[PDB]
Enzyme design. Structure first.
Site, PDB file in Angstrom:
ATOM      1  N   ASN A   1      66.970-115.182 -44.040  1.00 22.95           N
ATOM      2  CA  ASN A   1      68.037-116.192 -44.462  1.00 22.95           C
ATOM      3  C   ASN A   1      69.372-115.796 -44.506  1.00 22.95           C
ATOM      4  O   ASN A   1      70.205-116.861 -44.565  1.00 22.95           O
ATOM      5  CB  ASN A   1      67.737-116.921 -45.753  1.00 22.95           C
TER       6      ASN A   1
ATOM      7  N   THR B   1      61.187-107.163  -9.102  1.00 25.06           N
ATOM      8  CA  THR B   1      60.676-108.520  -9.454  1.00 25.06           C
ATOM      9  C   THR B   1      60.717-109.589  -8.052  1.00 25.06           C
ATOM     10  O   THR B   1      61.514-109.550  -7.493  1.00 25.06           O
ATOM     11  CB  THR B   1      61.736-109.243 -10.335  1.00 25.06           C
TER      12      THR B   1
ATOM     13  N   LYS C   1      60.467-112.556  -6.171  1.00 25.36           N
ATOM     14  CA  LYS C   1      61.276-113.765  -5.710  1.00 25.36           C
ATOM     15  C   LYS C   1      60.950-114.811  -4.573  1.00 25.36           C
ATOM     16  O   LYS C   1      60.333-114.261  -3.737  1.00 25.36           O
ATOM     17  CB  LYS C   1      63.003-113.621  -5.674  1.00 25.36           C
TER      18      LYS C   1
ATOM     19  N   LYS D   1      62.045-117.105  -8.139  1.00 24.55           N
ATOM     20  CA  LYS D   1      61.458-116.740  -9.521  1.00 24.55           C
ATOM     21  C   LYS D   1      60.248-117.770  -9.625  1.00 24.55           C
ATOM     22  O   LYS D   1      59.276-117.117 -10.128  1.00 24.55           O
ATOM     23  CB  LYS D   1      62.264-117.299 -10.656  1.00 24.55           C
TER      24      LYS D   1
ATOM     25  N   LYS E   1      56.672-106.767  -9.935  1.00 24.95           N
ATOM     26  CA  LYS E   1      56.394-107.537 -11.207  1.00 24.95           C
ATOM     27  C   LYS E   1      56.434-108.970 -11.270  1.00 24.95           C
ATOM     28  O   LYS E   1      57.221-109.415 -10.084  1.00 24.95           O
ATOM     29  CB  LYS E   1      57.378-107.285 -12.381  1.00 24.95           C
TER      30      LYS E   1
ATOM     31  N   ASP F   1      58.003-112.572 -12.279  1.00 19.27           N
ATOM     32  CA  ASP F   1      59.142-112.697 -13.165  1.00 19.27           C
ATOM     33  C   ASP F   1      58.716-113.218 -14.605  1.00 19.27           C
ATOM     34  O   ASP F   1      57.558-113.426 -14.752  1.00 19.27           O
ATOM     35  CB  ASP F   1      59.783-113.824 -12.312  1.00 19.27           C
ATOM     36  N   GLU F   2      59.647-112.978 -15.356  1.00 17.97           N
ATOM     37  CA  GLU F   2      59.546-113.152 -16.903  1.00 17.97           C
ATOM     38  C   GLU F   2      59.200-114.640 -17.139  1.00 17.97           C
ATOM     39  O   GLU F   2      58.150-114.755 -18.045  1.00 17.97           O
ATOM     40  CB  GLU F   2      60.665-112.885 -17.751  1.00 17.97           C
TER      41      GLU F   2
ATOM     42  N   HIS G   1      59.467-107.055 -21.402  1.00 22.47           N
ATOM     43  CA  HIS G   1      60.650-107.931 -20.981  1.00 22.47           C
ATOM     44  C   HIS G   1      61.262-108.317 -22.260  1.00 22.47           C
ATOM     45  O   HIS G   1      60.645-108.953 -23.004  1.00 22.47           O
ATOM     46  CB  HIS G   1      60.136-108.749 -19.800  1.00 22.47           C
ATOM     47  N   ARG G   2      62.603-108.038 -22.219  1.00 20.50           N
ATOM     48  CA  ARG G   2      63.302-108.571 -23.346  1.00 20.50           C
ATOM     49  C   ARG G   2      63.823-110.117 -23.133  1.00 20.50           C
ATOM     50  O   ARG G   2      64.996-110.533 -23.818  1.00 20.50           O
ATOM     51  CB  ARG G   2      64.417-107.610 -23.648  1.00 20.50           C
TER      52      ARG G   2
ATOM     53  N   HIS H   1      63.281-103.114 -20.622  1.00 19.53           N
ATOM     54  CA  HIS H   1      64.564-103.242 -20.335  1.00 19.53           C
ATOM     55  C   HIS H   1      65.898-103.204 -20.887  1.00 19.53           C
ATOM     56  O   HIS H   1      65.865-103.462 -22.091  1.00 19.53           O
ATOM     57  CB  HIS H   1      64.796-104.887 -19.642  1.00 19.53           C
TER      58      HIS H   1
ATOM     59  N   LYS I   1      74.317-107.775 -12.589  1.00 20.77           N
ATOM     60  CA  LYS I   1      74.982-109.145 -12.909  1.00 20.77           C
ATOM     61  C   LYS I   1      74.876-109.376 -14.324  1.00 20.77           C
ATOM     62  O   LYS I   1      75.463-110.483 -14.780  1.00 20.77           O
ATOM     63  CB  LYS I   1      73.939-109.887 -11.985  1.00 20.77           C
TER      64      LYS I   1
ATOM     65  N   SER J   1      67.919-103.252 -14.518  1.00 22.87           N
ATOM     66  CA  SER J   1      67.184-104.457 -13.549  1.00 22.87           C
ATOM     67  C   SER J   1      68.233-105.509 -13.591  1.00 22.87           C
ATOM     68  O   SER J   1      68.928-105.720 -14.528  1.00 22.87           O
ATOM     69  CB  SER J   1      65.900-104.944 -14.026  1.00 22.87           C
TER      70      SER J   1
HETATM   71  O1  LIG Z   1      64.919-112.474 -13.464  1.00 23.09           O
HETATM   72  C1  LIG Z   1      65.982-111.429 -13.243  1.00 23.09           C
HETATM   73  O2  LIG Z   1      66.801-111.820 -12.828  1.00 23.09           O
HETATM   74  C2  LIG Z   1      65.337-110.350 -13.018  1.00 23.09           C
HETATM   75  O3  LIG Z   1      64.055-110.560 -12.457  1.00 23.09           O
HETATM   76  C3  LIG Z   1      66.083-109.597 -12.076  1.00 23.09           C
HETATM   77  O4  LIG Z   1      66.020-109.869 -10.700  1.00 23.09           O
HETATM   78  P1  LIG Z   1      67.017-109.242  -9.415  1.00 23.09           P
HETATM   79  O5  LIG Z   1      66.438-108.115  -9.389  1.00 23.09           O
HETATM   80  O6  LIG Z   1      66.718-110.059  -8.315  1.00 23.09           O
HETATM   81  O7  LIG Z   1      68.431-109.373  -9.995  1.00 23.09           O
HETATM   82  C4  LIG Z   1      64.967-109.477 -14.427  1.00 23.09           C
HETATM   83  O8  LIG Z   1      64.048-110.205 -15.069  1.00 23.09           O
HETATM   84  C5  LIG Z   1      66.327-109.257 -15.004  1.00 23.09           C
HETATM   85  O9  LIG Z   1      67.082-107.816 -14.418  1.00 23.09           O
HETATM   86  C6  LIG Z   1      66.128-109.213 -16.416  1.00 23.09           C
HETATM   87  O10 LIG Z   1      67.459-108.922 -17.237  1.00 23.09           O
HETATM   88  P2  LIG Z   1      67.418-107.513 -18.293  1.00 23.09           P
HETATM   89  O11 LIG Z   1      66.918-106.618 -17.465  1.00 23.09           O
HETATM   90  O12 LIG Z   1      69.101-107.551 -18.428  1.00 23.09           O
HETATM   91  O13 LIG Z   1      66.553-107.838 -19.315  1.00 23.09           O
HETATM   92  O1  LIG Z   2      64.615-117.742 -49.898  1.00 21.59           O
HETATM   93  C1  LIG Z   2      65.181-118.524 -50.483  1.00 21.59           C
HETATM   94  O2  LIG Z   2      66.423-118.540 -50.467  1.00 21.59           O
HETATM   95  C2  LIG Z   2      64.430-119.833 -50.541  1.00 21.59           C
HETATM   96  O3  LIG Z   2      63.094-119.507 -51.001  1.00 21.59           O
HETATM   97  C3  LIG Z   2      65.190-120.674 -51.629  1.00 21.59           C
HETATM   98  O4  LIG Z   2      65.169-119.985 -52.841  1.00 21.59           O
HETATM   99  P1  LIG Z   2      65.892-121.184 -53.892  1.00 21.59           P
HETATM  100  O5  LIG Z   2      65.034-122.265 -54.054  1.00 21.59           O
HETATM  101  O6  LIG Z   2      65.800-120.264 -55.187  1.00 21.59           O
HETATM  102  O7  LIG Z   2      67.390-121.161 -53.543  1.00 21.59           O
HETATM  103  C4  LIG Z   2      64.155-120.427 -49.029  1.00 21.59           C
HETATM  104  O8  LIG Z   2      63.080-119.770 -48.428  1.00 21.59           O
HETATM  105  C5  LIG Z   2      65.345-121.046 -48.546  1.00 21.59           C
HETATM  106  O9  LIG Z   2      65.818-122.326 -48.936  1.00 21.59           O
HETATM  107  C6  LIG Z   2      65.207-120.818 -47.008  1.00 21.59           C
HETATM  108  O10 LIG Z   2      66.311-121.564 -46.267  1.00 21.59           O
HETATM  109  P2  LIG Z   2      66.051-122.797 -45.248  1.00 21.59           P
HETATM  110  O11 LIG Z   2      65.396-123.889 -46.180  1.00 21.59           O
HETATM  111  O12 LIG Z   2      67.815-123.122 -44.845  1.00 21.59           O
HETATM  112  O13 LIG Z   2      65.494-122.285 -44.065  1.00 21.59           O
HETATM  113 MG   LIG Z   3      62.971-111.700 -13.961  1.00 21.62          MG
HETATM  114 MG   LIG Z   4      62.532-117.878 -49.469  1.00 20.64          MG
END
Ligand SMILES: O=C(O)[C@@](O)(COP(=O)(O)O)[C@H](O)[C@H](O)COP(=O)(O)O
Ligand SMILES: O=C(O)[C@@](O)(COP(=O)(O)O)[C@H](O)[C@H](O)COP(=O)(O)O
Ligand SMILES: [Mg+2]
Ligand SMILES: [Mg+2]
Ligand SMILES: [Mg+2]
Lengths: 102, 467, 467, 102, 119, 102, 102
Positions: free
Chosen positions: C113, C163, C165, C167, C191, C193-194, C284-285, C317, C324, C369
């Site tokens: 939070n 990857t 292509k 995609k 691979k 693609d994601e 993959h991230r 990754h 790029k 990548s």
């Molecule tokens: O979707 C794409 O762009 C790729 O398949 C690269 O394609 P190319 O090899 O044709 O560029 C990878 O998923 C990215 O590199 C992910 O980025 P990161 O590695 O930064 O998480």
């Molecule tokens: O952890 C906390 O703060 C709470 O339990 C509230 O406590 P109180 O009732 O004691 O304030 C809730 O999870 C938040 O409201 C979540 O925020 P949101 O609703 O914005 O996702």
């Molecule tokens: Mg990809």
């Molecule tokens: Mg809470």
């Protein structure tokens, strides 16, 4: 025995009950009356007093039905309901009369 | 040459300002900040390309398929009021780019890689138009507002909840005690804190046991249906299912999950399980502000709100506007409608970029929670109306007389405000007077009002709409 | 009065500048931007309180437990070089606040939070010190670098991937064709693609079937062990398991998952499954830059890197630096060490805030990548060394002669650079000459070099370290 | 060893092969050439001779590449393919040349 | 469901229906479909050829396998059970499946073309 | 038959092989020699020529062992390995000699 | 109906009760009072009389609250509790007053 909406307020006067009925009608919703001697959390289906008052035009009509339900069922809890067929659900339900043994 | 190898500009293929979106296209509105020297339509075309079919150089394998039918197209780019370096890029994605019923897949395209490109200094997904044909591949809420009210037998007022405190460190039996006191005093719900899962100070099975003893006891004592959102947020899907199943075994009507920290794959599984087992599902949005706080980069909550309604929950936290956590009023009113209504027209004054149809998918209860107390009740009822859950954690357990008194104060405050509204009173103008009326006969409310008089949370808003 | 109800300042309880962290404490370093008028230590104390035990008003239930032992403490606040409105707040969390083996739980506290509080305009989690005692509750990588190299029988060079292509939009049989051509030309891996999961244009079971025919064919034809990361990213855990199991049934050595879009609960389950089934797990991230791109708000990737090594993957990754997508050189070298090494000392010049011990948890292969090609090979080998996977999607399928030629060009370029390095040559200073040497006898490399000569990605970096 | 389409007809002459290529081009499809020495039912992926001829304009261009493939791979089966990217699949695949050991 | 049997309507034929895309997307559709099937069979450029085994009923499992073998090895892509061949005293289904699949695999190896029998 | 690292380069000369051995020794790693007549992807365990040369001090020592292995096994593939006991894994493995039938 | 600790001893006098309260306070623990008319083995949560007396300094303060609880709930069982927040659990719980119908 709490009875959901308005149960934590002092019991409503007839005047306060009628204002809630007016709120139901003013918003185009259907007022109704339900009653039971079995008000606990297991009971989803209180008894209908007649049917929901699809044709009701005035709050006084509903209050007259409420008095008639109470006279016929003085040992029961009696609630006013407000119903919306567009959302298909009750928009308000509160107990208007509690029996002597409450 | 077999084909034309080498690097082209993305805009040659992926910028089409004369494209008319189809009613089946997924649409995205991106707030894009190009690097200096990068034409805005090239930056927008890069986003369209690298979230659909393209990469950084021409590949012969494009010619194996019908790229015209599969590519995303940036069909509109507009300047941003008050910022000459930001643009809104509108991008249309064909329906058959997306796995049916999979927000995970949708995210892997729409927000997968495009936020990290060197050519784009900042990127925020502001809105999406989800077509009815894609919505129909999703379950939606396990129950939704109308079914939930019918399952709880509660009509005509917001529901009332409460997060147990301190956040961490309580034992299972103490958790049950504070839950019992809260529920028996008039709250409909209590809940695990989002970070209460299973820990050395309190293991989850112990907690579930003592809490459900308290829930059933308070329900029998008061005569009103009660629930405690038992948190099934867990390290593995196997543990999550074990915790959901034990909640059901003990007779809980409701569980919660931290849908973002657990993640959308586990969330989708759990939503299906809740449908199959008749369990109400409260969604906590823990981690959302990592993503959705800043106006220049990330994903606005209104997008997350669409995705979670599609996968399905019965409640979702939506902010308070007036409490301790930020929530821009106009945008909040907007995505509350996106979560509850069946049709929401575009509205620039509330940040709604697209008309959104929900094709009868049930609505989700908004949950207003965090730093609110009795003096906020008039405005909370005004902002959200009846179909909301208002949660008071500190605002219940911080009552000077303890939890049952704190619960009664919040329940009395709510019912007095609802009564006054229904009678035709202006609850915003008369809010303080309404509370004082009820405090004359409710000593519990009187003490709560004394405790938090003039406690307010008023700060400059970071995530505001464009001026 | 039973206790002292009402609102206190968070710093009264949660700011302790004389606290000495224990070796079992979890430590966090937050870049915090307070609202004007909010003392920096009050904003830091709010983060500490609302990520551990506290809420916005005093609750009597604190007195049921030993708050001194459970509360997080902000133990240090420091100004930021070059910004008089940002501070680094160091916060210490007791070990028993956290569910064992659960990044989901850790996130629900540390980033649950606190990023949304009105009193805090912006918040970025920069680093965390994960103590050995908490690390030992996690599996770590299913296999890790040394085991993976032994399972693949590959030693002495970076591994090479690609990857497929375009995609989206390819059919299953076409996917198998392009995979076969890539692998048979000298790449170790291809691979999905994601965002290739299961879609109308290509359903996943069809894809897995045709791809694995291609993998086994290329392995037999070349004599080198091959793999294709079959993507098991899926809407539900049940679907994810089905896809992982079919990959195993078909004899794949490796699968991939989009660990952030699927989420940490499903990710933790899958990592355990990969350990139990002897399956290499490529991470993959996708979506990470939604969270980790901006220097003022979010979570830096180096934190995500710790969390994913704990849950466990065999590849992750990490960026290219020169391609790029953005990747600050100094920070990238830092979190590559965090992913591969057993001990990493604090280093401000690489954004490493804490010493980090890994207590023999295996390292994870970094994957470079995105927008890289043959001319980058000298620097990629210099940046990452042998223990990396270098992936060329467009840089393989964009070869003017097709995939097998593109694969050979990348494999030749890599081996020439590795040979030259081992001989004692300065591969950064001589990189272009080394490539030209190999192009004299490799027409495939010659054509790749002609295709992408002077294609570079050089932009001002958004996510830079403080000056 | 039968080789699917046209395998039950007598071997096609060069002029008959060219007419099939003209059919591919006339319909806007992409001609290609594949070859293998492992033609059985286990093999979905014969070797590509170059890439599918996306830029081919005349049947004679394709026949010249067929002769080149044969000259370079006289021990292989060689097929002509026609490909449609709209349906995304091959619209025709037939063996044009069988090796002597057939 | 009921509308074809009302007294007030002497006859009723449903001629066509417009199924909207939004309802279609709730269905799987074909397990594979034409393109995927051609790729799975490695067959391009002509209709496929099949054949129902006859007599419809009364053949034994081993005889079913024999006639399937002869059919497939002669150039058909497919053979099939008759629609009313399920499991019966003259031929139980597991026996049929066993002998038929021996024939299918044998004909596929002999011809070099992928074969199938619709069991 | 490709043989992993350096298989896509022209065959290494003795001089180029020795430079790789020097790279192994220079970094404190242990050089070794392995050989097999079964080089495919199923074989994780080529034959050891003696044991890894824990005591080797010069690259010439290793090249002498390489020549001796080749003379004894001219029909085999022969690889040079470099081994690190700290990471506990091979840091380099490449084929130095391929037999006539390659 | 036995009521756990000290239930097998004769009912405690007020002075014996006070000595137990002094034991709680002497050890730094928090005295409390709970009461119920449903004392059986199903009930983990007797009613709190106020909150645990975090601020109590003397045994007499607690005895005065015990008399008040008894006066207000003469039909209930009433127990004295002692609580330790360090171990986080009750260190003593015993019935001080039984109703006449015991
Ligand atoms: O979707 C794409 O762009 C790729 O398949 C690269 O394609 P190319 O090899 O044709 O560029 C990878 O998923 C990215 O590199 C992910 O980025 P990161 O590695 O930064 O998480
Ligand atoms: O952890 C906390 O703060 C709470 O339990 C509230 O406590 P109180 O009732 O004691 O304030 C809730 O999870 C938040 O409201 C979540 O925020 P949101 O609703 O914005 O996702
Ligand atoms: Mg990809
Ligand atoms: Mg809470
Ligand atoms: Mg028939």
């Amino acid at each position: 025995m709490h009875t959901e909406t308005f149960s934590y307020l002092p019991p409503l006067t007839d005047e306060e009950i009628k204002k809630q009925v007016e709120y139901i009608l003013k918003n185009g919703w259907i007022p109704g009356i339900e009653y039971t001697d079995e008000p606990g959390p297991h009971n989803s289906y209180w008894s209908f007093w007649k049917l929901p008052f699809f044709n009701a035009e005035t709050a006084e009509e509903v209050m007259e039905e409420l008095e008639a339900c109470r006279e016929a069922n003085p040992d029961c809890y009696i609630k006013i309901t407000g119903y919306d067929n567009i959302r298909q659900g009750q928009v308000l339900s509160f107990v208007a009369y509690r029996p002597h043994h409450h | 040459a077999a084909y034309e190898a080498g690097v082209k500009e993305y805009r040659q293929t992926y910028y089409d300002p004369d494209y008319t979106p189809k009613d089946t296209d997924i649409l995205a509105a991106f707030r894009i900040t190009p690097q200096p020297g990068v034409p805005p339509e090239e930056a927008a075309a890069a986003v369209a390309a690298e979230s659909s079919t393209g990469t950084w150089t021409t590949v012969w394998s494009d010619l194996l398929t019908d790229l015209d039918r599969y590519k995303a197209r940036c069909y509109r780019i507009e300047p941003v009021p008050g910022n000459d370096n930001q643009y809104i890029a509108y991008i249309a994605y064909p329906l058959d780019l997306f796995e049916e019923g999979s927000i995970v897949n949708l995210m892997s395209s729409i927000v997968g890689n495009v936020f990290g490109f060197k050519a784009v200094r900042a990127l925020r997904l502001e809105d999406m138009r989800i077509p009815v044909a894609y919505l129909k591949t999703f379950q939606g809420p396990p129950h939704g507002i109308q079914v939930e009210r019918d399952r709880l037998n509660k009509y005509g007022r917001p529901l009332l909840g409460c997060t147990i405190k301190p956040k961490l460190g309580l034992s299972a039996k103490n958790y049950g005690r504070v839950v019992y006191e809260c529920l028996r005093g008039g709250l409909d719900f209590t809940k695990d804190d989002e970070n209460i899962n299973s820990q050395p100070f309190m293991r989850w099975r112990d907690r579930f046991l003592f809490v459900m003893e308290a829930v059933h006891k308070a329900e029998a004592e008061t005569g009103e249906r009660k629930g405690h959102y038992l948190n099934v947020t867990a390290p593995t899907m196997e543990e999550m299912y074990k915790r959901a199943e034990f909640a059901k075994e003990l007779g809980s009507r409701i569980i919660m999950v931290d849908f973002l920290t657990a993640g959308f794959t586990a969330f989708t599984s759990l939503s299906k399980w809740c449908r199959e087992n008749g369990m109400l599902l409260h969604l906590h949005r823990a981690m959302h502000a990592v993503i959705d706080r800043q106006p220049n980069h990330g994903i606005h909550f209104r997008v997350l709100a669409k995705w979670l309604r599609m996968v399905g929950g019965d409640h979702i936290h939506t902010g308070t506007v007036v409490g301790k956590l930020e929530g821009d009023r106009a945008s909040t009113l907007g995505f509350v409608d996106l979560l509850r209504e069946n049709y929401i027209p575009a509205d620039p004054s509330r940040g709604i970029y697209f008309d959104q149809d929900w094709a009868s998918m049930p609505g989700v209860f908004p949950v207003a929670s965090g730093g609110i107390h009795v003096w906020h009740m008039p405005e909370l009822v005004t902002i959200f109306g009846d179909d909301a859950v208002l949660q008071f954690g500190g605002g219940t357990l911080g009552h000077p007389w303890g939890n049952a008194a704190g619960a009664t104060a919040n329940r009395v405050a709510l019912e007095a405000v609802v009564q006054a509204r229904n009678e035709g009173r202006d609850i915003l103008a008369e809010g303080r007077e309404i509370l004082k009326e009820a405090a004359r006969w409710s000593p519990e409310l009187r003490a709560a009002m004394e405790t938090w008089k003039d406690i307010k949370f008023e700060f400059e808003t970071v995530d505001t709409l464009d001026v």
